[PDB]
């Protein structure tokens, strides 16, 4: 059960910002429920899976493409180069969204919404889910920060151990090599002494 909420500016009244919520069970392809709120009034509607197919047929485009366009539009997944226009009429109770591009607009979809009995419950539920989401995000952030501290400490310890290994390696190698050049030099001394003096005499 996934719900998303977004902010949209209606064409009729640019100053105020309406708020649009979509709730779906598992996917938009299976239909969903739409509620539009203004902070003092609200409307609701459904796009049940049965309708979706007929809506796609009317649009005359790929069904997957239509569901993708709806997903990118309603869920504020719009790209920088994509602009969408939503027009809602309360006298006739319609709400249609289109995409504007190259100064020409192509119809995307249209739904009908019936005014709800009491906006208070809708607003209360919206902001309740909001507050719960704040709390959940804060808890997740705290846990992630704790894990981050753990990982940073572990990395620092690993670096220290690796440096210690380097120090041990260098010390051992240099000690052994010096200790052996001593002995080789001693033998070189004796062999030179022999080959020179004992051959001259």
């Amino acid at each position: 059960m996934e719900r998303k909420i977004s902010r949209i500016h209606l064409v009729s009244e640019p100053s105020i910002t309406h708020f649009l919520q979509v709730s779906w069970e598992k996917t938009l392809e299976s239909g969903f429920v739409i509620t539009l709120t203004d902070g003092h009034s609200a409307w609701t509607g459904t796009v049940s899976e049965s309708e979706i197919s007929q809506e796609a047929d009317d649009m005359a485009m790929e069904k997957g493409k239509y569901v993708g366009e709806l997903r990118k539009a309603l869920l504020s997944g719009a790209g920088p180069a994509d602009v969408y226009t939503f027009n809602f009429s309360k006298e006739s109770c319609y709400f249609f969204f289109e995409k504007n591009l190259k100064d020409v607009s192509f119809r995307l979809g249209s739904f009908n919404l019936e005014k709800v009995e009491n906006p208070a419950e809708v607003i209360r539920e919206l902001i309740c889910y909001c507050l719960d989401t704040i709390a959940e995000n804060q808890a997740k952030n705290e846990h992630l920060q704790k894990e981050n501290e753990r990982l940073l400490r572990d990395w620092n310890d690993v670096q220290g151990r690796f440096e210690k290994c380097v120090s041990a390696k260098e010390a051992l190698e240099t000690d052994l090599y010096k200790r052996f050049i001593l002995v080789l030099n001693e033998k070189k001394t004796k062999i030179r002494s022999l080959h020179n003096k004992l051959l001259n005499a």
Copy 2:
């Protein structure tokens, strides 16, 4: 500028949730603004430093503890062993919160609120602020997730290379000893040949 939204259950109507937001410039001592809304109408009031100080003096107790209790009550900071009761009267527009304690109630605070002339603006602003909060916290969470994944990968790689470093260190000593022995026997045969030939001659 700091803000905090909380859910409360008024004793006058213990069936619906009312949402109270406290907004204070820097700290609760200077003052704050209380906005209490139930989804249809909102009441806004202000508390300045002078009234908090006067109530603390009337409270017969230190200012710091009074502000601590105020924060614990209004800012949702209540722990397990504490219960608070909020009473709101609309006819007189009078708010006051108390602390229940084994059938003993303390009148912690009594505020006066004035009904706003436009609840839609305030409700929209509240939900807008919360939506911005979620949008900003999601970015932090995803960035922290990315950083933690990167750190885990790097830590795994460094430890894996440390295994090989240590393993090679455990064999360098034999690697050195082999070569040292070999050179020693070679020059030992040299000196032996020299001595044997001279003694024979």
